[PDB]
Write a protein that binds this ligand. Structure first.
Ligand SMILES: *[C@@H]1O[C@H](CO)[C@@H](O[C@@H]2O[C@H](CO)[C@@H](O[C@@H]3O[C@H](CO)[C@@H](O)[C@H](O[C@H]4O[C@H](CO[C@H]5O[C@H](CO[C@H]6O[C@H](CO)[C@@H](O)[C@H](O)[C@@H]6O)[C@@H](O)[C@H](O[C@H]6O[C@H](CO)[C@@H](O)[C@H](O)[C@@H]6O)[C@@H]5O)[C@@H](O)[C@H](O)[C@@H]4O)[C@@H]3O)[C@H](O)[C@H]2NC(C)=O)[C@H](O)[C@H]1NC(C)=O
Ligand SMILES: *[C@@H]1O[C@H](CO)[C@@H](O[C@@H]2O[C@H](CO)[C@@H](O[C@@H]3O[C@H](CO[C@H]4O[C@H](CO[C@H]5O[C@H](CO)[C@@H](O)[C@H](O)[C@@H]5O)[C@@H](O)[C@H](O)[C@@H]4O)[C@@H](O)[C@H](O[C@H]4O[C@H](CO)[C@@H](O)[C@H](O[C@H]5O[C@H](CO)[C@@H](O)[C@H](O)[C@@H]5O)[C@@H]4O)[C@@H]3O)[C@H](O)[C@H]2NC(C)=O)[C@H](O)[C@H]1NC(C)=O
Ligand SMILES: *[C@@H]1O[C@H](CO)[C@@H](O[C@@H]2O[C@H](CO)[C@@H](O[C@@H]3O[C@H](CO)[C@@H](O)[C@H](O[C@H]4O[C@H](CO[C@H]5O[C@H](CO)[C@@H](O)[C@H](O)[C@@H]5O)[C@@H](O)[C@H](O)[C@@H]4O)[C@@H]3O)[C@H](O)[C@H]2NC(C)=O)[C@H](O)[C@H]1NC(C)=O
Ligand SMILES: *[C@@H]1O[C@H](CO)[C@@H](O[C@@H]2O[C@H](CO)[C@@H](O[C@@H]3O[C@H](CO[C@H]4O[C@H](CO)[C@@H](O)[C@H](O)[C@@H]4O)[C@@H](O)[C@H](O[C@H]4O[C@H](CO)[C@@H](O)[C@H](O)[C@@H]4O)[C@@H]3O)[C@H](O)[C@H]2NC(C)=O)[C@H](O)[C@H]1NC(C)=O
Ligand SMILES: [Ca+2]
Ligand SMILES: [Pt+2]
Ligand SMILES: [Pt+2]
Ligand SMILES: [Pt+2]
Length: 1377
């Protein structure tokens, strides 16, 4: 009975058969569930269910009966099935099939509904006797994202099937059995089934908004009744209403959806209830008032992640993690509590800190470092104070002089190399002479004969008294040509000054063989260099235990840490942490490690891979119950416990050397539990044999002394290859990121590798690896775990590893830090402090729940409207707990909620009277008749949406008008999910920077030019508009491919994850595709694309004009604008439109305008980037579209474009604007009229701000402008517009009209070609005498009038009606056609 508004969304691809959709939804990523169900339907088991409901009903019984899903997983299945999450995954198959299979399968297909593909040969029969073809094109055997494999087999077999028919069942069984035997590996690909209809897909998981477009009025339903200054209490009174209500969750939803309507209805019946002002004790401690914050098991979620799809993927990932933990008898509550524990988060913060290594001589008994200083005893520094306050009282960029030991620098030098020697002589000594407060040491490098000798020479001379003498040899040797070999001619003169007085020393060129000098000194030195990996092609310098490689201005690097260390000391001093009797260098050495490994301590701190240990022993039980295992000792302590697994190629010296070290390390550490996985490069000989050789010798392996005993044990014994072991072996490596013949080391789930050389990982390297790993991951788990009293659950080394490994996985970055939010992956428990009695309500059983949600919603917020709606539906799921906190603000200067909101989502599928799946829609009932409303779509980030069906003006909705024009109080509108985004964040390799101005091309096997875009400066951002299918990204041929080669598109993650050296993208989800591509510069390039070392016309048109209209009137005016151009030019014109702001009525009309006026048209759009600052106000969005995305909105093939406003009319042949010289400027604009005499008052660009800023430059008009696009992109103007906009936009009152104001603010930075004013006329600011020579007319809003735009047009232009009549009769001609 009530006046209603209904909005629905449909996808750009037809609905896949329900059967296949349930198969896919059901088996998310578990293959066993997939083929176990594929058997069931090939029985013909699912043939007897006639309707979708019955079919759905059948799946529930099956899954429950076969043990596939438990209540928790079943509930999750229903929600994912409502969401229709599997539909794009199925469409990926079809698009792949349509575009790569059919054109590479030459011949005549009839009866070949299904067909296996074997060795590039097609077989239409199960009996496999005859083969139709040699399939053309690239290999289809490439394993791609949507593939499934069943079994391991030398041969690879693919079946392209239409499951729907019964013709499928025998083909399946042929290859299912063939795989069950082990002849070949089986996989299913889909074929679009013609039994099913080509009806489009009805989607859900989006939001609809009805925005009040008139907010200006402030002091069943007709119009909202407003309110005076009492705004301040809205949030507060709104929060109370709910608390009081009795069924609070429902209230919030009912209140929050129709909130603008209930504003005046608040403040009634002794409303405030001031008990809830008690809990600002909880605002005093943690979050600011009116802020929306969501947590999922401690994880703080960003707004983008708060949609149904984003949330389904998070549960899926989270449950996998927790379930792993709760097989050790922990409740979901206990598991989460452990993950977010204080001791755990402390460790992440702990090793976010920079790493230092112990540079001391202590281990090598003080005989390796030859210091050029001592600050406590050098009689250079005698003058200086040895006081702590000297440090603390130092400001500036310098360094305080002090007689104390505080800063140290040890530099390893090769005495053969001139450049290396030069460092000590010039570099190091100057610093000494200069009285720098840094102690300087150096240790010689011994990698060649001559080097060994020269270390001996210098070292020995020093050891047993010589100082200045050794220095002297070095200096003389360096200056005296270039000595990279000992020179006696030079050496002998140095000795001539007989300063060798302090206690007897040997003399001559006998390069000493003294067991003390040659052996101890040189071997001790080598032990220091090896220990800290301080040698090689690139040696390593240690400043305060901080490794700085000896490359390009390392002293610049040193100075940076020198200042950073000094500031670190000062802070401790002002807090009185420091005292006078202290060794200051040991403030840094507190956490320093004795040994240094680049694998354990990579310089890229993020580089970390951890595997779920429970998973490893669950998936590969067949493998891991038959690997040689050294159990960790019976009588060792929990603190000692650790689990180690070594993966190695025992058919290589490095592979077996690595294992010998691991075995050696095990003898020493009784607590470790060792596993050996033999991973061979060549699988001609079964891997099971060598594993079987060792497990027999398992008792006897740890009981030995020599390497050959291990070598010999590998050779001896006769064994039967367990091919079942071999299968689980190759599955393990595939699941883990591991190649064949590659060496890896796994301690408590953490993987290091591949190990290229076994000298990289020695016995001493395992010891530090355990020491470091122990610290971070094991000790924080142990403490935290014990604090909760769950320390009964640890029963051994393998038992422990399950927990430590899981908690390490919980804190993994992906989504990468610095992209969506800078904040680290730390699970807070910080809201547990909050009192809950009067602001919170919970839904779900906390005792059973695996998912714990903590929502902090401000009822007065518009963001809250969506949050409540989504959370209600996720709250309905079994095994989920939710707790809500309401936190309003007292700061309400403007109206809080200015829209109505509906979320299209269900927790389980709904069925028809005919049993078909119910489509979902947003229905607003009892809409006020007199309020002007705007329809908006609040769609997931990867989606691009436009109106398809609507007869109404969605930008100007009023029920009274529709009733008085259409006769109906009921409105229906249908949208189309036209595109889904492929978006990514680029980087250059190895010196990672965003490659800006790089051009990209998206392609498919059908067409090599799907789309094109250019790389942005901000996060190396780029995007493509696409739908489900298999694509490829090639750098655009030209300057881009000249400078770069892209190794990869980051489809696996930030990585590099091995196996991702690919350029293939596929989208099979409603979340699109997120990519992290990598591009490495070609041989010796410091080049830039942006600077140099009839095409567009042919492709498009002579003239390219683009525009936007946001209403039926403005669209009607746009029709006139296009016509005026056409009458005024006999040239070829192409029109470009901003697709999403236009009505379907307009959209359905243009082909008819194009036939009549003879122009070409193209619809364009771009999705507003996530990083780029949003516009809550639609009019402002539109303005942003005209200026911010000029370089990326139009295809690269377009040389230039012209913007003409909708209300405009043109009397000129528009080419002239193209031919207009821009004198090296990217875009051209027309200025504001000065000609009108008496208008001055309203000319605001002659005021202080605009006249001070625009020193001499004009105040330009955004109604008309030219963009020399080739130059625009070449100058990279867009990036500058975007970052200045983002920076300026922080202030809300910054840009009144951004479109005009941005080019004006940027005309100093970016040239603006100024146009002849013959190019623009407006009555408001130009005289009537001016219009004779006027080229085009804008209808600028007169502010001294209220005469409407329709009136100005008829009065101002007499030919306006002539244009309108033409359109009017044509519209009727079409309607009567
Ligand atoms: C776009 O599309 C079309 C086709 O491609 C075309 O559009 C033209 O636009 C004009 C308006 O700009 C149309 O109107 C005519 O404009 C002229 C003014 O130039 C008017 O005089 C004319 O009225 C009468 O005369 C027409 C023909 O007379 C003209 O002839 C001379 C032009 O040169 C050609 O002459 C003949 C063809 O006639 C040919 O053999 C030659 O090789 C030349 O190519 C010119 O010297 C004339 O001027 C004298 O005479 C007039 C009186 O006629 C007098 O007033 C003058 O003082 C002078 O002594 C004269 O212009 C005739 O066709 C009309 O029917 C009418 O009787 C129109 O109002 C025009 O119809 C139209 N077509 C052409 C081909 O011109 C353009 O090619 C395209 N335009 C753009 C912008 O892209
Ligand atoms: C000035 O600068 C100094 C130097 O930088 C700073 O001094 C102290 O720095 C410590 C941090 O490194 C803080 O810890 C305190 O230590 C003292 C003494 O150290 C004890 O432990 C040592 C550890 O031994 C191991 O390691 C060394 C190598 O590092 C190795 O050689 C050993 O073999 C061994 O493996 C011992 O070497 C040392 O002999 C001594 O035992 C300690 O007294 C502090 O303890 C306080 O708190 C505990 C409870 O946490 C309490 O039990 C203590 O009671 C004492 O008194 C009763 C009754 O007489 C007696 O029964 C006990 O046996 C205790 O002796 C005591 O109240 C603490 O652990 C320390 O904070 C820090 N400063 C102070 C003031 O303590 C510091 O900046 C300044 N200190 C001074 C005094 O100048
Ligand atoms: C992909 O999907 C498949 C199928 O949906 C999943 O595979 C399932 O995994 C189950 C894992 O537990 C497995 O259960 C096994 O059942 C046998 C027979 O009872 C047990 O011998 C196995 O050993 C494990 O558990 C026992 C003790 O548990 C049993 O007894 C208690 C009562 O005392 C019962 O509560 C319990 O349910 C078990 O019956 C231990 O002693 C062993 O040491 C060992 O840990 C397994 O429990 C299923 O057979 C298997 N298939 C099906 C149809 O459910 C697969 O997990 C999934 N993968 C992913 C990634 O989720
Ligand atoms: C969540 O909800 C709880 C509900 O209990 C709030 O707790 C209140 O906390 C305040 C501040 O601590 C309490 O007020 C004070 O209590 C003192 C007694 O407790 C102290 O001593 C015990 C040991 O005996 C300690 O364990 C404890 O930590 C306290 O230190 C009184 O001595 C205080 O009196 C002082 O102030 C008054 C008023 O100015 C003077 O007249 C006195 O002479 C004296 O100087 C004081 O009363 C309060 O009792 C607690 N309860 C309530 C209902 O408020 C949490 O604050 C709240 N947290 C959040 C984040 O919202
Ligand atoms: Ca205008
Ligand atoms: Pt400095
Ligand atoms: Pt401090
Ligand atoms: Pt991003």
């Amino acid at each position: 009975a009530s006046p209603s508004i209904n909005v629905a969304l449909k996808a750009a691809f037809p609905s896949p058969p329900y059967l296949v959709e349930l198969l896919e939804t059901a088996a998310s990523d578990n293959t066993t569930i997939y083929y176990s169900l594929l058997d069931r339907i090939a029985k013909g088991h699912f043939a007897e269910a006639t309707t979708d409901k019955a079919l759905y009903e059948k799946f529930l019984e099956v899954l429950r009966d076969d043990g596939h899903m438990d209540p928790e997983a079943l509930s999750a299945f229903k929600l994912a099935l409502s969401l229709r999450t599997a539909t794009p995954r199925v469409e990926a198959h079809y698009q792949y099939y349509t575009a790569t299979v059919e054109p590479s399968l030459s011949g005549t297909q009839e009866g070949c509904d299904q067909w296996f593909l074997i060795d590039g040969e097609q077989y239409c029969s199960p009996t496999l006797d005859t083969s139709h073809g040699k399939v053309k094109g690239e290999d289809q055997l490439r394993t791609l994202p949507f593939d499934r494999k069943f079994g391991v087999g030398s041969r690879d077999v693919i079946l392209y099937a239409d499951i729907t028919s019964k013709s499928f069942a025998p083909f399946h069984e042929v290859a299912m059995d063939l795989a069950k035997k082990g002849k070949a590996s089986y996989r299913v690909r889909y074929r679009r089934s013609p039994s099913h209809s080509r009806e489009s897909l009805s989607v859900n998981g989006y939001g609809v908004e009805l925005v009040l477009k008139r907010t200006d009025y402030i002091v069943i339903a007709d119009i909202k009744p407003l309110e005076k200054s009492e705004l301040a209490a809205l949030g507060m009174k709104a929060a109370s209403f709910v608390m009081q209500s009795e069924k609070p969750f429902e209230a919030l939803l009912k209140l929050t959806q129709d909130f603008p309507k209930y504003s005046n209805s608040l403040g009634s019946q002794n409303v405030s209830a001031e008990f809830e002002a008690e809990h600002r004790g909880n605002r005093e401690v943690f979050l600011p008032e009116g802020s929306n914050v969501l947590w999922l098991n401690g994880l703080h979620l960003i707004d983008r992640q708060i949609q149904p799809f984003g949330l389904v993927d998070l549960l899926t990932r989270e449950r996998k993690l927790i379930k792993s933990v709760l097989d050790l008898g922990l409740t979901g509550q206990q598991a989460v509590d452990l993950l977010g524990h204080a001791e755990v988060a402390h460790a992440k913060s702990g090793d976010d800190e920079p790493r230092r290594f112990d540079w001391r001589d202590d281990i090598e008994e003080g005989q390796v470092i030859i210091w050029l200083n001592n600050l406590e005893k050098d009689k250079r520094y005698k003058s200086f104070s040895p006081s702590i306050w000297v440090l603390i009282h130092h400001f500036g960029h310098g360094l305080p002089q002090i007689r104390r030991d505080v800063f140290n620098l040890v530099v390893p030098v090769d005495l053969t190399k001139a450049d290396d020697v030069k460092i000590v002589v010039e570099g190091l000594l100057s610093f000494v002479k200069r009285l720098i407060p840094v102690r300087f040491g150096f240790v010689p490098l011994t990698p060649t004969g001559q080097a060994i000798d020269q270390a001996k020479v210098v070292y020995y001379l020093l050891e047993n008294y010589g100082l200045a003498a050794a220095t002297a040899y070095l200096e003389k040797s360096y200056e005296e040509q270039s000595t990279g070999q000992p020179n006696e001619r030079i050496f002998n003169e140095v000795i001539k000054d007989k300063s060798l007085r302090p206690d007897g020393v040997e003399l001559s060129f006998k390069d000493i063989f003294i067991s003390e000098k040659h052996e101890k000194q040189i071997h001790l030195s080598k032990h220091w260099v090896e220990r800290l990996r301080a040698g090689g092609d690139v040696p390593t310098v240690f400043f305060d235990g901080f490794p700085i490689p000896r490359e390009d201005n390392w002293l610049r690097v040193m100075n940076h840490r020198l200042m950073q260390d000094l500031q670190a000391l000062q802070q401790a001093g002002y807090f009185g942490m420091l005292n006078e009797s202290m060794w200051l260098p040991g403030f840094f050495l507190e956490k320093a490690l004795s040994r240094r490994n680049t694998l354990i301590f990579p310089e890229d701190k993020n580089e970390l891979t951890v595997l779920n240990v429970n998973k490893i022993y669950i998936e590969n039980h067949d493998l891991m119950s038959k690997v040689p295992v050294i159990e960790a000792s019976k009588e060792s302590t929990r603190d000692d416990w650790a689990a180690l697994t070594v993966v190695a190629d025992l058919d290589d010296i490095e592979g077996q050397e690595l294992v010998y070290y691991a075995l050696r390390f095990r003898k020493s550490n009784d607590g470790v539990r060792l596993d050996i996985v033999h991973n061979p490069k060549d699988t001609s000989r079964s891997p099971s044999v060598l594993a079987q050789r060792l497990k027999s010798r398992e008792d006897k392996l740890l009981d030995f002394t020599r390497f050959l005993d291990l070598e010999t044990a590998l050779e001896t014994g006769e064994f039967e290859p367990d091919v079942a072991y071999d299968a689980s072996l190759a599955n393990f490596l595939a699941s883990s990121n591991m190649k064949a013949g590659d060496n890896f080391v796994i301690l408590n789930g953490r993987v290091l590798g591949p190990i290229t050389s076994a000298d990289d990982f020695k016995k001493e390297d395992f010891e530090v690896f355990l020491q470091a790993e122990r610290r971070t991951r094991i000790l924080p788990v142990y403490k935290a775990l014990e604090d909760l009293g769950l320390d009964d659950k640890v029963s051994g080394p393998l038992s422990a590893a399950k927990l430590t490994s899981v908690t390490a996985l919980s804190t993994i970055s992906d989504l990468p830090q610095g992209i969506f939010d800078n904040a680290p992956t730390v699970r807070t428990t910080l809201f547990k402090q909050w009192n809950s009695t009067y602001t919170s309500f919970e839904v779900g059983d906390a005792s059973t729940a695996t998912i714990f949600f903590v929502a902090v919603i401000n009822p007065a917020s518009e963001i809250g409207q969506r949050w409540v709606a989504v959370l209600k539906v996720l709250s309905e799921l079994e095994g989920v707990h939710l707790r809500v906190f309401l936190n309003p603000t007292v700061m309400i200067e403007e109206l809080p909620v200015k829209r109505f909101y509906r979320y299209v989502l269900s927790s389980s599928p709904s069925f028809d009277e005919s049993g078909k799946v119910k489509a979902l829609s947003a229905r607003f009932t009892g809409v006020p008749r007199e309020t002007l409303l705007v329809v908006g779509m609040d769609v997931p980030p990867a989606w691009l949406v436009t109106s398809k069906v609507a007869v109404d003006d969605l930008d100007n909705l009023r029920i009274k008008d529709i009733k008085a024009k259409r006769g109906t109080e009921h409105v229906e509108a249908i949208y189309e999910l036209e595109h889904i985004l492929i978006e990514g964040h680029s980087r250059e390799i190895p010196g990672a920077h965003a490659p800006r101005g790089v051009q990209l091309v998206l392609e498919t096997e059908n067409n090599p030019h799907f789309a094109d875009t250019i790389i942005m400066a901000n996060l190396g951002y780029f995007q493509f508009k696409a739908n489900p299918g298999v694509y490829n990204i090639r750098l655009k041929e030209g300057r881009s491919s000249e400078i770069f080669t892209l190794e990869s598109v980051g489809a696996k993650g930030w990585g590099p994850i091995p196996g991702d050296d690919n350029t293939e993208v596929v989208l099979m989800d409603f979340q699109g595709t997120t990519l992290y591509p990598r591009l490495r510069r070609k041989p010796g390039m410091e080049e830039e694309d942006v600077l140099e070392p009839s095409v567009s016309k042919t492709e498009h048109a002579e003239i390219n004009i683009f525009s936007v209209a946001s209403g039926h009137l403005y669209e009607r005016m746009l029709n006139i604008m296009m016509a005026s151009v056409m009458h005024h030019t006999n040239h070829t014109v192409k029109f470009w439109f901003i697709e999403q702001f236009l009505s379907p009525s307009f959209k359905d009309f243009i082909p008819h305008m194009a036939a009549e006026y003879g122009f070409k048209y193209e619809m364009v759009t771009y999705k507003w980037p996530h990083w780029l600052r949003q516009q809550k106000e639609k009019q402002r969005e539109i303005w942003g579209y005209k200026i911010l995305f000029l370089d990326v909105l139009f295809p690269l093939s377009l040389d230039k474009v012209i913007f003409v406003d909708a209300d405009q009319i043109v009397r000129t042949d528009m080419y002239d604007l193209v031919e207009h010289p821009l004198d090296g400027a990217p875009y051209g604009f027309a200025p504001m009229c000065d000609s009108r005499v008496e208008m001055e008052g309203y000319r605001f660009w002659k005021t202080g701000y605009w006249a001070n800023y625009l020193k001499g430059k004009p105040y330009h008009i955004s109604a008309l402008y030219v963009v020399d696009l080739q130059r625009f992109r070449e100058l990279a103007a867009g990036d500058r517009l975007r970052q200045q906009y983002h920076a300026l936009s922080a202030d809300p009152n910054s840009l009144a009209n951004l479109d005009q104001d941005l080019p004006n603010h940027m005309q100093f930075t970016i040239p603006i070609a100024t146009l002849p004013q013959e190019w623009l006329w407006c009555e408001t600011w130009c005289s009537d005498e001016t219009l004779k020579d006027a080229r085009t007319i804008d209808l600028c809003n007169n502010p001294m009038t209220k005469e409407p735009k329709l009136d100005r047009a008829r009065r101002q232009v007499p030919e306006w009606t002539k244009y309108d009549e033409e359109i009017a009769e044509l519209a009727r001609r079409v309607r009567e056609e």
